[PDB]
């Protein structure tokens, strides 16, 4: 029993430093991107995701806090059943390991007016055999508020951090999934009514034959995970044609750079 023989002093070892070190290694995974093809029958639309924007999306992300982008695209001139993803849009957001928080307002920019919305992509820490109930709820609420999101055409792509790699899987809602998700108020992991038949897998392919681009906010950056207080479901934003900054870029965590200045 040492009140005095053995005294020790606590020394902060803060969480985000370790995660910043980890996020600096994300580029290694962009060489090991897998798409699951466990779906069958080939009936719905086929989605083609250009590798350049997917690699960038991975590189700007975090191992533990999900990030999301909005998907915009069109069909090739003569194959209406193929959807080419041409743009990812990053909007102000924050996330946990289980969900992302986006504004209510969807991207508006003239430069996107010739594309159709195709849904959204998000990262998550681990693979999962099923589409999470949070994703179903989020997608269903977006669709309920935005009739431009066609339930037969908008998808969720999940980007799961597997060993030294990323695994992509794409899903869409079913009618019953829309109806359950739009009324679901239980944010937990096992909300009542949630069913495996609330979604289904959809065919997705990676491509090197064309390039997508990004749009990002016009006056902020997209990452608010260090300033959630400044983030609001009702916030509004404009967009610009530019590429997104990585998760731990200085413009995302300016309080680390003003507070260190006090020793």
């Amino acid at each position: 029993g040492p009140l005095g023989s053995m005294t020790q002093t606590f020394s902060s070892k803060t969480e985000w430093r370790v995660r910043a070190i980890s996020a600096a290694n994300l580029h290694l995974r962009t060489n090991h991107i897998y798409v699951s093809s466990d779906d069958i029958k080939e009936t719905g639309y086929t989605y083609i995701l250009p590798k350049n924007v997917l690699k960038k999306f991975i590189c700007i992300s975090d191992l533990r806090a999900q990030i999301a982008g909005y998907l915009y695209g069109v069909s090739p001139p003569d194959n209406p059943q193929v959807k080419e993803i041409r743009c990812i849009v990053m909007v102000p957001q924050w996330g946990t390991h289980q969900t992302v928080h986006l504004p209510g307002q969807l991207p508006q920019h003239e430069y996107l007016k010739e594309m159709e919305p195709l849904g959204w992509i998000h990262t998550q820490p681990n693979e999962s055999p099923q589409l999470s109930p949070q994703d179903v709820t989020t997608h269903a609420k977006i669709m309920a508020d935005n009739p431009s999101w066609d339930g037969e055409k908008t998808i969720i792509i999940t980007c799961s951090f597997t060993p030294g790699s990323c695994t992509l899987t794409a899903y869409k809602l079913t009618p019953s999934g829309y109806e359950w998700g739009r009324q679901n108020t239980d944010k937990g992991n096992n909300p009542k009514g949630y069913l495996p038949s609330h979604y289904e897998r959809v065919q997705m392919l990676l491509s090197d034959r064309f390039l997508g681009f990004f749009m990002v906010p016009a006056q902020s950056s997209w990452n608010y995970n260090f300033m959630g207080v400044r983030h609001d479901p009702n916030m509004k934003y404009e967009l610009q044609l530019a590429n997104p900054k990585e998760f731990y870029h200085e413009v995302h965590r300016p309080s680390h750079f003003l507070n260190f200045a006090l020793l």
Binding site: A24, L211, Q240, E246, E250, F257, F260, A261
Partner: protein, 1719 residues
């Protein structure tokens, strides 16, 4: 030499640096003695006696100095002792000197004398100094010394008008400070890093004198920098055989004789050694060596010692106490004063009642500093580098006024202020060395300087210096201070780094160069004299007496180290060294070689800030830094908070370094003394280390890391993170308001859309809303926009417009602001293009246009980005997305015309023996292309296009059409255009032979002179012209029948329509088409071209049907071309050229070991350097003279005809060179030697690539950029030049192939592959050059309204290309209404400009008419802006010399990219000429001729390549003059017109109005003029009216020379004049005044003007000018060309009846002296 050994350099290093003590014993002056005390020993050394003025060495009075140098001793009566002994050597000779004397003895005044000698070398006869002829470098070891020397030298020399200055650490903008300064004062390191960088016409060629102050720094760890400077200077000297004087100033220490050898000082002439008895004040020395080892007891022992010494001087002498930490000054002064209070001795310093107390008491109340507060009233003071300036001046003025009694200070005082003291105490000799990471002894230079402050030169009879140190160091300090510590070399450590710097410069290219270089090192001299000291046995030395082998071993070792670290590629067998880009960066940024190896190993495009900080922290500059236990808690506190995470533990040094940098950027205060000094060291290094990293990753194209590292450079410089308000960078803005702005998170960008009011309200501080608004709009900001101009489907041209969008203010922007333009790919990952952009103050409100090329591909990528980012301001960037969604790409180009495999065509196919005789001796068969096109050319009248590579024999294709013309029409006229005058001359020779000699037709070459060119056109069957000479003629085609009655129009090199002078070629071709459509007897057109991808558009524009369009691609060249494009990854030009030197030789031996070779190089200088370097390489191949194929004796008669000796040597070894600076005779001789196979290699400057008459088997193009001195930037070779160079690799009669190696910067390689292996796309640029042509067409009534102007445009190549490649011309579609709108817009713009300029009128906004001013511009072929300027400046009383100034300022004159150093020569020309010129500005391309005209006129001088320059200027002068005449004549003025006419005469004969007419006669001079004045003859007619014998006697001239005089006299104009006033009585007021003048020559001469100093051949022009000088009024004027007899009318109105007496003038434009006057 083969058996080399690898040495351990670290085992040869003297680890103690300047503390190394080579002497084993120290002898002390007589009367020294050693006292013992508890725990320490004292040694006392008495003051010395001065040597008693032996040798009757009188003090030299300033009177007996040379008069130019006395001014430098204004306010002195005599010299002092040392300068009197040094006067003759310093002031009366140029001998290199070494002066050893005790510090303070006067050495700097001797350096002053050397500077005066140099300045004397540059006296004008007006007494001024040509301050631009020379630089002097004064190297001083310490920065504070640099500053004090700038001040005192500047004051001593200001009377000379000379500028002394130091150099800023910023040099990428402030290198104009070198240009402005005559005396540069800097540290060794600064001059080393500046001269490591080899540039273009830098000022190191002006260096005549280098002074190395405190040269005993050789013994310091810094000493190798001096060795590098001296070895570099001496080797440069011998390289260039221009002498440079070296002066060394040294303390008196052993080995001075070896220092003198090192400086090339002749010991009998330039070595002077004054021992310590020459100290200005004798010095009693006390050394105190403490034996105590326990730190605690040792420190109190030291404080008791200093108190006892203080007590010995209290109230009798001031004491200066030197300590080694700014904090120690206060702590020590406090220890002393506390001991004085406790011992009650403070009264001895500050006496009560004395006036000194009374003086101190004032600022003893005031007290600006805190420690100064606690200490100043007691009589104590501190002084150091954390204090203010006026605090330091307070201390200085108080001490010097004998008021302060005890001043504690640091070394900075000793170096930077001239403050001596009776007693000096050095309190300890230990100092903390961050770079060594530990405590060491003070350096010797510091110790010498501090003790040199002991004793004040007039007050004290002696000084007393007291040094307190540890006992074991006594013998060192005793040795240092009594002339016995020997000066050694520290170079072995630094050898790899120093060797790399010389490899990077090209001074050392192999191991033997390196042995030679090491032979000039101080190390080598010391190795020779004390071998065992340097690790060499005495028997090693006897077996190797010049240490050739040992130097080889050292060089081998260092080179292997450099090669292991990838700075150099070292070939062990040949000893050769290949430079690399990473080696260049190491040298130019002063980085050690291990560091750049670490960077090369760890830098990756994917690095984040975390790893970038870690990389920086591993630099080897920090390898001695450790983490001390006592530092670990504070460091941990900083680590757990740093904003950039650190991965490694605080056990490792790299984490401490990282954290220290980050703490510096955040401006944290640290507590540990070691941590603070370590931070200083780390961050002083960080700026240049991080700029090196930046240059590396930028040139690799790594977009994200380029951004992060440029940002980190800026955060280190500004000491803040990105996140902070960029307004912090305005130091004047008070921090509080910026903190308030930061607290609010809103974007800084929002501030732009606010005003004073809203700005005051947003931060809730209205009082500042105005000044904030000011600073917001001083923040640098640029608006961007692009014009995308597709070249092909895979290459895009971008024109970026940069518009400044901020208010300039010199107080925050200086004189320039630098930016990086980065063009980045879709992902912002690769930098596709980048460049430096400098916004100068003078252009701060102007838009700037930048053009560059990027690659593109299909399917088009979404977008690129253009970022323009400040090089210095944080968060100062604009990024423009460049979307391609609406890019219209041109159609993929069609396949070529297939080369059919036909029977080669015998010459007999001409079916004409006379025709066949032109070729049947040359060859038996025509080549495949000639064979394919022959039927169409020779047997049809169809318009023909032949596209094919240079060297395909297209000229013969045109000859076929000419021969058809000759069979159709006995007097056929073929006009033949080529774009380059040198080509025109060659074609003139060849075709004069073929068509005049063997065919008896008339071949003529247009000259540029209208009437004679009209005569040539009339009589010629073949008329050869460049484009402008045909433009001016064919403008007047409605009145020139010989222009319409052209049978054949051939245009050669028509692909140049797409280049710089393409518009005029397009215009004349379009005109010939329009004429042919208007005269219904069509003009056959044949167009010849390099292979064109869009040939069908040229053909269609020129009326060539597709079966008559031969569009061949490069692989059809009849002599196959083997083209190799070799990329060189070095971004610095001189270094890249260095890396090319050996590949040039290897390309010769691989591709053309026996057959002739042309090497094209970027500049005149490089031609000689590359010839020499090739010779050097083949000598080291033991293959010297392999390029010489005739025998030397067969070559000597040639060699004598040359003035260039170097050219004679190289030619003797089989290598020639050609550059613009060679007399035409020399050039012809070299070309003859080359073509006759006598010499195998010729090196030619790029600018000759169009006028060479040689061809080779192999062409090497060594680099593809050249330096434009006008804009001070490198410019890429036009693709047209490169194609023409490649074309020289072509010998159809002799080679089975041609070979060409292009060596280019790596980032150019893809471009050349696209535009040499494939046919070339060309565009029009007529839309940028429309005004003069519109104006001409309005004058000749081809354009009479705006509809005519659109119709006119439809005949152009511009018009066709607008539908093929609309975005190139800024159309957004090809619809006919798009076309019509675009053309209308262009037409309205052009006609509006011409109307504003008063060249044309516009009525009812539709109809255009020419104004007389437009008619003049068109008639004389002068740019409309020039003639507008003429219409402005001219008046009724402009002076002649003003005319010269006007004419020099004209769009016509932009021709000089060579000389800025002759600006001073022109400054003195201004005095030599009687031109009272106004506005003495200087250095413009137009300002040359402002007086370079007069340089021609007076016959003043013939000088250099400027000769060629003058010949172009004079070419345009007459027209310009005549325009002025015309202007004046139209206004009505009588006098200034005649002035202009006589100036025409002046330019022709090169004389002036007041000068003598006799200056016109050949073989005359001034003595003949005064003799003819003595006889009384002043006219040419006078000389004609003399007897032949008396004529021959008066002139004192040769027979043939008076025959020259006679020919001039028999073409001199002697014209009989007569006039008649038609109906002279019947003249009514209001009617006509028809005056008639008949003129008759006396012998109807038929030669042109005799005008040897005027280039072109001139016909004689005359003006019949009737006016009245009564009021400067001209009433009628007519120009005339007189042949034998001419009858001239003149019309005039008679206003009112009255006095009617008028003056008739007859004025020549050519001769001076025939100007008549009749009534």
């Amino acid at each position: 030499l083969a058996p080399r050994q690898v040495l351990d350099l670290e085992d040869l290093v003297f680890t103690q640096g300047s503390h190394f003590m080579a002497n084993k014993r120290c002898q002390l002056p007589d009367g020294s003695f050693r006292r013992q005390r508890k725990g320490y020993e004292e040694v006392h050394v008495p003051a010395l006696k001065p040597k008693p003025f032996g040798s009757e060495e009188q003090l030299l009075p300033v009177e007996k100095l040379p008069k130019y140098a006395q001014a430098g001793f204004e306010g002195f009566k005599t010299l002092n002792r040392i300068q009197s002994k040094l006067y003759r050597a310093a002031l009366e000779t140029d001998e290199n000197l070494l002066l050893c004397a005790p510090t303070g003895a006067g050495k700097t005044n001797v350096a002053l004398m050397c500077m005066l000698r140099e300045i004397g070398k540059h006296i004008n006869m007006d007494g001024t100094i040509n301050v631009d002829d020379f630089k002097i470098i004064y190297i001083a070891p310490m920065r504070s010394l640099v500053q004090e020397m700038v001040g005192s030298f500047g004051k001593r020399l200001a009377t000379y008008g000379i500028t002394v200055a130091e150099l800023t650490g910023d040099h990428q903008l402030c290198k104009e400070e070198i240009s402005a300064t005559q005396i540069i004062v800097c540290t060794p390191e600064k001059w080393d890093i500046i001269t490591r960088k080899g540039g273009e016409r830098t000022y190191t060629q002006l260096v005549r004198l280098i002074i190395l102050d405190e040269i005993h720094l050789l013994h310091d760890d810094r000493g190798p920098v001096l060795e590098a400077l001296v070895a570099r200077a001496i080797r440069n000297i011998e390289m260039t055989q221009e002498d440079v004087r070296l002066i060394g100033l040294s303390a008196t220490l052993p080995n001075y004789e070896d220092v003198a050898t090192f400086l090339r000082v002749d010991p009998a002439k330039g070595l002077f050694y004054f021992d310590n008895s020459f100290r200005p004040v004798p010095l009693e020395q006390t050394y105190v060596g403490i034996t105590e080892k326990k730190a605690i007891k040792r420190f109190q022992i030291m404080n008791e010692i200093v108190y006892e010494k203080i007590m010995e001087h209290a109230g009798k002498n001031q004491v200066l106490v030197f300590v080694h930490s700014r904090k120690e000054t206060g702590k020590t002064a406090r220890a002393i004063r506390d001991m004085c209070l406790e011992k009650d001795t403070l009264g001895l310093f500050l006496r009560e009642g004395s006036a000194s107390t009374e003086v101190l008491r004032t600022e003893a109340e005031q007290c600006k500093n805190l420690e100064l507060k606690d200490l100043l009233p007691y009589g104590f003071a501190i002084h150091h580098a954390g204090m203010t300036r006026v605090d330091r001046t307070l201390v200085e003025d108080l001490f010097a006024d004998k008021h302060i009694q005890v001043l504690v200070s640091t070394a900075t005082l000793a170096w930077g202020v001239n403050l001596p003291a009776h007693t000096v105490i050095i309190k300890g000799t230990q100092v903390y060395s961050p770079e060594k990471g530990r405590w060491t002894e003070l350096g010797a230079l510091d110790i010498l300087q501090m003790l040199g402050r002991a004793g004040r030169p007039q007050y004290d009879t002696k000084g007393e210096g007291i040094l307190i140190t540890s006992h074991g160091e006594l013998q060192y300090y005793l040795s240092l201070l009594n002339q016995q510590l020997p000066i050694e070399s520290q170079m072995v450590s630094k050898l790899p780094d120093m060797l790399n710097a010389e490899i990077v410069l090209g001074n050392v290219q192999n191991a033997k160069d390196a042995v030679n270089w090491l032979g000039y090192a101080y190390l080598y001299i010391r190795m020779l004299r004390s071998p065992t000291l340097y690790g060499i046995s005495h028997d090693d030395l006897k077996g190797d007496p010049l240490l050739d082998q040992r130097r080889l071993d050292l060089v081998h070792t260092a080179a292997l180290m450099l090669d292991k670290n990838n700075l150099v590629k070292y070939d062990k067998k040949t000893g050769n060294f290949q430079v690399t880009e990473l080696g260049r960066i190491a040298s130019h940024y002063y980085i050690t070689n291990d560091t750049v190896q670490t960077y090369n190993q760890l830098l990756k495009p994917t690095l984040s800030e975390i790893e970038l900080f870690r990389v920086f922290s591993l630099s080897s500059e920090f390898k001695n830094i450790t983490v001390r236990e006592e530092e670990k808690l504070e460091l941990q506190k900083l680590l757990e908070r740093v904003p950039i995470p650190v991965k490694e533990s605080i056990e490792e040094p790299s984490a401490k370094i990282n954290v220290l940098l980050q703490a510096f950027i955040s401006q944290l205060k640290l507590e540990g003394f070691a941590l603070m000094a370590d931070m200083v060291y780390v961050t002083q290094s960080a700026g240049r280390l991080m700029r090196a990293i930046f240059e590396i990753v930028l040139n690799r194209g790594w977009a994200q890391l380029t951004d992060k590292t440029l940002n980190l450079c800026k955060m280190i410089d500004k000491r803040m993170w990105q996140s902070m308000c960029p307004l912090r960078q305005f130091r004047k803005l008070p921090e509080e308001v910026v903190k308030k702005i930061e607290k609010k998170n809103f974007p800084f960008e929002r501030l732009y859309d606010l005003n004073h009011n809203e700005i005051g309200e947003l931060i809730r501080m209205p009082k500042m809303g105005k000044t904030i608004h000011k600073y917001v709009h001083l923040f640098p900001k640029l608006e961007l926009s692009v014009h995308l101009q597709p070249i092909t489907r895979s290459t895009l041209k971008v024109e970026l417009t940069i518009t400044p969008d901020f208010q300039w203010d010199e107080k925050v922007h200086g004189s320039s602001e630098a930016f990086w333009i980065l063009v980045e790919d879709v992902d912002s990952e690769v930098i596709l293009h980048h460049e430096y952009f400098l916004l100068k103050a003078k252009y701060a409100q102007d838009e700037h246009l930048i053009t560059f090329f990027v690659p593109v591909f299909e399917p088009l990528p979404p977008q690129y980005f253009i970022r323009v980012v400040s090089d210095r301001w944080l968060s100062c960037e604009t990024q423009l997305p460049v979307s391609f969604r609406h890019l219209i790409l041109p159609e993929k180009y069609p396949p070529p015309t297939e080369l059919l495999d036909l029977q080669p065509l015998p010459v007999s196919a001409l079916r004409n023996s006379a025709f066949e005789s032109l070729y049947q001796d040359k060859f038996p068969f025509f080549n495949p292309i000639q064979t394919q096109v022959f039927n169409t050319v020779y047997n049809s009248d169809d318009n023909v296009f032949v596209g094919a590579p240079t060297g395909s024999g297209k000229t013969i294709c045109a000859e076929f059409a000419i021969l058809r013309m000759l069979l159709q029409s006995s007097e056929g006229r073929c006009v033949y255009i080529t774009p380059m005058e040198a080509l025109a001359e060659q074609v003139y020779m060849d075709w004069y032979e073929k068509f005049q000699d063997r065919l008896n037709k008339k071949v003529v070459l247009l000259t540029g002179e209208t009437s004679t060119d009209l005569k040539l056109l009339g009589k010629g069957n073949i008329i050869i012209s460049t484009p402008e000479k045909w433009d001016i003629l064919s403008r007047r085609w409605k009145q020139r029948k010989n222009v319409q009655n052209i049978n054949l129009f051939v245009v050669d090199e028509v692909h140049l329509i797409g280049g710089e002078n393409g518009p005029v070629l397009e215009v004349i071709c379009s005109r010939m088409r329009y004429i042919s459509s208007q005269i219904e007897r069509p003009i056959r057109i044949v167009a010849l071209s390099s292979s064109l991808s869009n040939a069908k558009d040229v053909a269609h524009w020129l009326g060539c049907s597709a079966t008559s369009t031969f569009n061949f691609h490069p692989n059809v060249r009849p002599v196959p071309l083997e083209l190799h494009i070799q990329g060189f990854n070095i971004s610095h030009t001189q270094t890249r050229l260095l890396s090319m030197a050996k590949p040039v030789y290897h390309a010769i031996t691989k591709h053309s070991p026996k057959k002739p070779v042309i090497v094209f190089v970027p500049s005149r200088k490089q031609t000689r350097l590359t010839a020499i370097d090739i010779l050097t390489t083949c000598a080291a191949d033991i293959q010297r003279q392999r390029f010489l194929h005739c025998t030397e004796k067969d070559l000597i008669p040639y060699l004598e005809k040359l003035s260039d000796s170097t050219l004679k040597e190289t030619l003797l070894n089989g290598v020639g060179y050609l550059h613009e600076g060679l007399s035409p005779m020399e050039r012809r001789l070299v070309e003859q030697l080359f073509s006759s196979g006598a010499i195998q290699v010729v090196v030619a400057s790029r600018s000759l690539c169009w006028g060479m008459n040689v061809a080779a088997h192999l062409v090497i193009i060594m680099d593809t950029q050249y330096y434009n001195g006008k804009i001070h930037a490198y410019v890429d070779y036009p693709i047209y030049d490169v194609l023409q160079m490649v074309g020289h690799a072509n010998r159809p009669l002799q080679d089975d192939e041609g070979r060409c190696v292009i060596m280019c910067q790596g980032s150019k390689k893809d471009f050349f592959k696209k535009f040499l292996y494939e046919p070339l796309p060309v565009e029009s640029h007529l839309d940028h050059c429309m005004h003069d042509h519109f104006n001409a067409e309005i004058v000749t009534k081809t354009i009479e309204n705006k509809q005519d102007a659109v119709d006119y445009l439809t005949w152009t190549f511009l018009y066709r290309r607008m539908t093929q490649n609309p975005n190139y011309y800024n159309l957004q579609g090809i619809s006919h209404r798009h076309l019509s709108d675009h053309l209308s817009e262009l037409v309205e713009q052009t006609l509006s400009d011409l109307e504003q300029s008063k060249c044309i009128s516009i009525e009812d906004e539709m109809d255009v008419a020419p104004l007389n001013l437009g008619m003049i511009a068109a008639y004389y072929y002068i740019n409309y802006t020039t003639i507008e300027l003429f219409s402005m400046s001219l008046n009724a009383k402009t002076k002649v010399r003003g005319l010269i100034e006007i004419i020099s300022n004209a769009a016509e004159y932009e021709n000089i990219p060579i000389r800025h150093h002759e600006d001073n020569l022109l400054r003195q020309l201004a005095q030599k000429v009687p031109h009272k010129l106004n506005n003495p500005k200087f250095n413009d391309p137009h300002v040359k001729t402002n007086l370079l005209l007069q340089a021609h006129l007076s016959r003043m001088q013939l000088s250099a390549e400027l000769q060629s320059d003058t010949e172009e200027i004079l070419s345009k002068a007459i027209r310009l003059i005549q325009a002025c005449v015309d202007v004046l004549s139209s206004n009505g003025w009588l006098s200034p017109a005649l002035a202009a006419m006589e100036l025409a005469q002046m330019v022709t004969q090169a004389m002036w109005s007041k000068d003598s007419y006799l200056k016109q006669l050949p073989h005359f001079t001034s003595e003949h003029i005064k003799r003819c004045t003595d006889k009384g003859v002043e006219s040419v007619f006078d000389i004609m009216e003399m007897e032949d014998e008396e004529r021959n006697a008066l002139l004192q001239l040769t027979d043939s020379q008076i025959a020259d005089v006679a020919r001039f006299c028999n073409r001199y104009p002697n014209i009989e004049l007569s006039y008649e006033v038609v109906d002279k009585d019947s003249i009514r007021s209001g009617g006509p005044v028809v005056v008639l003048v008949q003129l008759e020559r006396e012998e109807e001469v038929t030669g042109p003007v005799i005008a040897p100093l005027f280039p072109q051949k001139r016909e004689e022009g005359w003006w019949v000018v009737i006016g009245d000088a009564k009021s400067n009024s001209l009433i009628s004027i007519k120009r005339l060309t007189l042949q034998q007899k001419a009858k001239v009318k003149l019309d005039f109105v008679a206003p009112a009846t009255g006095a009617h007496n008028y003056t008739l003038y007859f004025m020549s434009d050519a001769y001076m002296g025939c100007d008549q006057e009749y009534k």
